[PDB]
Each structure stands twice: as C-alpha cells, then as structure tokens.
Design a protein around this ligand. Sequence first.
Ligand SMILES: Nc1nc2c(CN3C[C@H](CO)[C@@H](O)C3)c[nH]c2c(=O)[nH]1
Ligand SMILES: Nc1nc2c(CN3C[C@H](CO)[C@@H](O)C3)c[nH]c2c(=O)[nH]1
Ligand SMILES: Nc1nc2c(CN3C[C@H](CO)[C@@H](O)C3)c[nH]c2c(=O)[nH]1
Lengths: 287, 288, 288
Amino acid sequence: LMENGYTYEDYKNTAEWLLSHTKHRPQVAIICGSGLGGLTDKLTQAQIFDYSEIPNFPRSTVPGHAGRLVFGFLNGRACVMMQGRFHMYEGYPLWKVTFPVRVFHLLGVDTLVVTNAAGGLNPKFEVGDIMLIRDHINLPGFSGQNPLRGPNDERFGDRFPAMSDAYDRTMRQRALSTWKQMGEQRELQEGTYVMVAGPSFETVAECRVLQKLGADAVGMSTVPEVIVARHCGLRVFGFSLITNKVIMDYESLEKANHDEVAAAGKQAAQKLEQFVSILMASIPLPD
Amino acid sequence: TLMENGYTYEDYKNTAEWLLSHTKHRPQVAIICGSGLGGLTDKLTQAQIFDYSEIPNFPRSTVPGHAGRLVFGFLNGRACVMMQGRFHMYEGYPLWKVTFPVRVFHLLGVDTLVVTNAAGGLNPKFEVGDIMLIRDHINLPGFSGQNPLRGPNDERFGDRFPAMSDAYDRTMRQRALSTWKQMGEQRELQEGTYVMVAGPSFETVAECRVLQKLGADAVGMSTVPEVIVARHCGLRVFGFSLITNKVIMDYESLEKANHDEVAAAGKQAAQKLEQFVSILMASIPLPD
Amino acid sequence: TLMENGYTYEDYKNTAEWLLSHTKHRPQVAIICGSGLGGLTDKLTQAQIFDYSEIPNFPRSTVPGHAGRLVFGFLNGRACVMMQGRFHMYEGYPLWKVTFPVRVFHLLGVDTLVVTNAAGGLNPKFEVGDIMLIRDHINLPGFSGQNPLRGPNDERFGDRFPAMSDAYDRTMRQRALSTWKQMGEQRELQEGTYVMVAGPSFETVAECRVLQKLGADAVGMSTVPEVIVARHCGLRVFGFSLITNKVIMDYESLEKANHDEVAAAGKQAAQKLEQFVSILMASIPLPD
Ligand SMILES: Nc1nc2c(CN3C[C@H](CO)[C@@H](O)C3)c[nH]c2c(=O)[nH]1
Ligand SMILES: Nc1nc2c(CN3C[C@H](CO)[C@@H](O)C3)c[nH]c2c(=O)[nH]1
Ligand SMILES: Nc1nc2c(CN3C[C@H](CO)[C@@H](O)C3)c[nH]c2c(=O)[nH]1
C-alpha cells in the first residue's frame, strides 16, 4: 500500500508534546510561504520551537523558509504560525508535507490560513498584488498524488470528502469589504490557484495550458494542506502574493527566477502583516 | 529502483488454476461491479461465491458498497464471472494490484470484460439515474506515469505498445444502443467520454470546469486501468457508468458530492441495470 | 521515504572519467537518437562504439529500435557523442535514471544537447515524414511530480528552481529556418510544441483531442526530462521530432497507432534526416 507512514498515535504524540511544552492554545494556524516569514514578527508573547525539536516533524529545505513553529497572539487571536513549509519537490511525500495540519487539528485549531508566493497567470494581475484564493486545481491530485491516498482514518474524517466548498465564503466576503481599510491603489484580487509540482518553472506553452484551464495563479504548494484541513473539518482561508508574471510569449527575454520571488516578498512584508492582522478580527470566535 | 509489476506470470497462473480447481464454472464474460452496483449478481443462476480473502494473491475491497466477493454463474444463460466490488488506487493499491483480476480472467478463458461504475455527471444533459455507454476515456493518471503497463512488458499477455483508440467495442455499442428499445424506458441511452481522476476527494468547481473543457461527460476514480490491461491482453471491452450525481459547477450551490448519495442512487437504479446487462449478454459473441 | 536521485555526484564523475580514459574523442555536442533514428550514427567518422552494458552506471535500452550504444566520432567535422537508443519512464526507469547520461555529458565537456524523437502528429497540417523543430514542450508528468530534479538539489550541477521558458535555443531555431528557406525547399520546416505523455499505451481519440486543445502539435513519451536536466546544468538545447504517424482523431477510422509504422518512418526519412542534421550541426556555435 502507498499509504500514510504516520499512525494516529504519531500525530497524537506530537500534539501532546507541543501541549506539554507550551501554555498557548491556538485557535488559528497560519502557514507562511516563500519570503512571507515576517508575518511572525507582530506576534505578542511569542514562543518559538525549531522544527528539529518537535517529534515527527519534517525538516525545511528551501531558502526564505526558516523551519520554525511559533505560538502567540496576533491582534488578540491565539495563533500558531509555520515559519516555512514543506514541498513535494524537495522529495517529501504528501503525507509528510501535510503532517502539521493534522497536528494542529489535534491541538484544537479550527481555522487554517494558508499563504504562498505564486506566479501571475491572469494578465490583469500585477507584481505585488494579493489574490484571495477562491478555489484550486490540484493537478497532482488528478494523477494520484493526494495526501489522503491509503487507508482512511475515521478519527480525522470521511473516506470521500467534498472540496467544492473548500475556501470559506464568509471570510472571503469580509476580506473584500475590509480591503477599504488599507486605502491601496490596487484592489484585492480573487481567483483560482493551480498547484504544479516543480521545482523547474513553467514553459510558455505550459503557462498557456494553465490559463486555458482557468487558473489565475500558479505555485508549488498549499493545495495538499487545504485538502487535509478540509478532511478534518478546518475552516480554510487562503491567499497568494503575486511575485512575478509568468512568461507567456516567445519574444520576452525575462525569466522566472527565485531572487525576484524573494525580492517581491521583502517589498510586500508591510502590506501582508497589516492584511493578516486585520483578517484575524474577521475570523469567527469558537463554539 | 525499477517500478514494475510485483506479480510474476506464475502468480496470475496460480490464482487462475486455484479458481478452476474449486469451481466447475468456466466463464466467458467477466463483469466488474462498481459503487452501489453489487446487485448486478442477484440474477445469476447456479451461483458460486468466493470471498476475495480466500483467493490466493487477490487484494481486499476496503470501500463501503463493495462486498469483496467473486461470483461465478449464468446471466441469461451466459457463463459469467462477476467482481462484486473492485479496487481503487485511492485505497493505496498500485495499478498493478488494482488490475490483478483482469489478467486472472484472461488466464481462466474470459474473452469479454464488462466494466461498470458509478460516475459524476459533467455533461448537463445527463440526469441522476442515467446510464452512459462509455464511448471512450481520458486517462489523466496515465499521462503522468500511472499506467498499469509500466515496467517490463510480458509478451505472454501482450504488446509493449498497445493501441487504445478502439478500446470500447464499436459493435456491442451499436447493438446496445439499438437494443435499448427493448426496455421501454423514458430516458434514452446516453453515450460519452469517461475521465478518471485518482481521488479520493471530490472535485472543486474549478476542477469540474477543467474536466468539462477537456470534453469529459462523466468522472470517476476507477475502470480505466482495468480497460487498459484488458485491451493489452486481447479482451473485448464494453463499459457503462451510472450517473449518480451532477458534479457541482458553481460556487453558490449548497449541494455536495457524497458517498451516501452515490450508494443510494446505485440501489435505486438496481432493477434497471440488471435488466440492461441481461439483454446485453445476448449481443456478446461466442468464440469460433 | 524521501524521493531522491539515487546517484551521487561521484557516480557521474566515475562514468565520465571512465569514458575520458577509453576514448580520445572530446565531444562538444551530444545527440540522443530516438525510435528508428539510430541510423543517424552511420555518417560519423573515426567512430568508436561502447555498448551501454560496458559503461559504469549506464542503464539499458529495452525497446526495439534502440540499439543501446554510445558512439563517439566526427559528424560533419564536429566532435560528437551519440546515444543510439535512449531510456523511457514506461520501461520502469525513474527519471533520474532516464536522464543520467545528460550529466555525464556535461562532465565530459559537452556544451550542446540535441534531442531527437519519433512523435505522433496532433496538428493536422503535419504529414508523416515531416521533421518538426521543437520550439517548446508541455511536461504533463512534471505537473504531477514526475520531474527528474525532484529531491535535494546538487548546486554542483545547477540551481534549485531553473527556468524553462527559454529551453529550446531561439538562435539555432532562427538559423535552421533561414537555412531551409535559403535552400529553396518545397516542403517547409514544421515548428511546434511537443507534449510528453508517460505511455506505454497509445492515446484514445478523446485523449488526442485533449492534447490538441492544450496547444500541442506532437506527442511522445520521452525527451522532456533530458531537456530539463540539460538546462539545469547549463547545456544549450535543440530538439526535433520525426512525425511518424498521425494520431487517430475520430471514431470512424480503422487505423491504429503501432510500433512497426514508427520504424518504417525512420528508414524512409533517412536522407531528409541526414540533410537536416547537417544544417543543424552547422548552426551550433563553437566554444570560446
Ligand atoms: N510554479 C510556479 N511557482 C511559483 C512561485 C511559488 N514558489 C516560490 C518558490 C520558487 O521561488 C517555489 O516554492 C514555488 C512563485 N512564482 C512562481 C511561478 O512562476 N511558478
Ligand atoms: N471523481 C468522482 N467520482 C465519482 C464517483 C465514483 N466513485 C464513487 C466513490 C465515491 O462515492 C469512489 O469510488 C468514486 C461517483 N460520483 C463521483 C464524482 O462526483 N466524482
Ligand atoms: N505517445 C505517443 N508516442 C508516440 C511515438 C514516440 N515513441 C515511439 C515508441 C512507440 O512506437 C514509444 O517510445 C513512443 C511515436 N508515435 C507516437 C504516438 O502516436 N503517441
């Protein structure tokens, strides 16, 4: 069987270890993507764990991803923040990539906020823009790479969970209204995020495929975390920072490259911090 | 470091010889029964039942509404073997396990495979309860590497590079379409393209729109691997889907795909499916 | 459980040193010959042949029409190494084995990779026997995780996240087309997008239609992984396909894709292929 290497008991031990070693009790988990680790600077009463301390955690390998779990309060809300994440392209199976999401469920988290860098496929997008994720296209999932493959553990969720309501309608409505409170020249964009495995960037022909399929942005993460979160009942909210426009003609001499991506994160850090801090107020209270 | 079939020729043959030893039945036609369609075995005569767990080298069905039994008998006087329950790659099985029984059926003497499944309707003219004849398929996992024929080719089964443009028998499709009049149902017999996705999660709205843009009429998580292995070894293949739900294609809808609704639409379409298959048996050729 | 390249840097280095000691040839250009295109080695002078089986760490070719030899020599006065036969993921090889020679060629001092293949024509204006210059590719297995660069990156070869938008060298492409015009050719040179599918089974009609809708002009089961590895380590890349057959795009045809027709095409195209390879070799810049 191509199954989950972790048992329920493995997820439980990691959860109990974290509950022993901190007094924090997060309601919200935030996964910070490529060059968005500055979202953990505004946390009050921060307690930090390195991923290598925490039993059963995977290592973080990619530049701009620190490898640190941080508990704290963000604008009043009890939060846990993954400073850096795991990617299929680093060689991890998807049951390792998504291991933290289930641990968070067992801590008592009820809301997952997922952030990423993404390449812009919709031509109306501009570098620096923030796109709310209305929906995704899980290209690896079509082929068999789904983190729920293998035996289903009823203790987390259903054998066959729906994803047609994955991205919380209500939190999206509130973040569109709230957008007035940043007075930005640019509007809050909304669209479909497509996951591709990477780690190489898209050809022009691939870019046009993705546009034709109806995607507005592209990246190499996030979707598996969303599936596992919806499987175990988490409210999910997501956004992408558009870090580059994907090359869509043969004439251009520009090329996607990681430095440009990291650089668009340094520029946007102020705007995101403020966006996320306001978002926290729009999250429903528990129970 | 080689990604190959974990069964040897000898494993298939051993399983086939075990089966031939423990039954007097000698099936000509194999029928694979999908989700909610296990009632297709109800009208077999002189039935003999094996549990999958008794049969050497056989995998286990882990999905609700797949009984996990191999049933030999007579359907409208034709010698059949029926898989009451099937396997899926979402369960953890490699495609070489999922398709194990198709090659066993070849070694037993079977020459025609009937595949059935439940499917989500993507074509808006389909209603819940419709039967779709599978004209063709789109093998999305196959594009990316997940093909049951990956690895060394065994010439005892078939060619290294089998064609699939003729996978679903053109003559039985003519005969089944013209035969439909024999049941005097309100809906006509639907026809279309089946697309496989791995699952086990259901589609997002954006994914539903992808599959519609690609030209699929219905979506499921099975069948295609079985059909590829069947064509590779020379089997004639006929397929159909029961449309159990319309896949959600807009953000406003309250409706959600779920297994209980799928299984219930299965049992509602019970009588009707048994009857269609029974009459279909009369259109399958004998050897010689 | 970590899904990584099974070769160390020192495996590649050992294979490269072994080749450097066993031949005096010092190639600048590597050419990978695909199905039925092994005849491109005939015009090499001062040829020195190695069977893949005698070279350390080399995989084996298992497909008919792939001789399994590495040939060093001069092709039109330019120092080349030719793979007479390549490896495919459908044989069961992981993509890090499929692409193993590309990095060996880098360490031998090669600076240009030419990739050739047979392909099925999707664009209806292509005829059997056409040569299509590859302007671009669509890596369908790559979308799903089947990428030869997956796992830890070795900085000794290249970057973690390499760009592919400029993979097929534009200048070589321009020169090849100018030259073909300057010759005053009747049948103009085709240019288009190659899509990789895993195989080994050929496409259904519905699958052919999907690949047309995605913007692909030609379909095969190779090439793309080699190009990705080539670009990762700084090689200049040029590809072309021989269109060996037209992909079946309607249900009324009785034709079927088959391997025999693919070999018949290669022998038939031999003079055309030689002429094109000459044009192409004279388009490759010299080192400084
Ligand atoms: N596929 C893809 N991903 C990204 C990303 C997202 N990640 C950023 C990082 C490479 O800079 C990888 O983890 C992918 C930003 N831009 C792009 C792009 O153009 N394409
Ligand atoms: N992908 C998909 N498959 C199905 C199926 C077919 N199978 C039914 C079962 C889930 O109920 C799985 O084995 C998939 C029915 N409806 C749908 C759908 O809407 N989508
Ligand atoms: N996928 C695909 N590949 C090819 C090829 C390329 N290879 C030729 C060989 C089978 O003839 C495999 O390695 C694939 C030629 N024609 C076709 C086709 O119609 N389809």
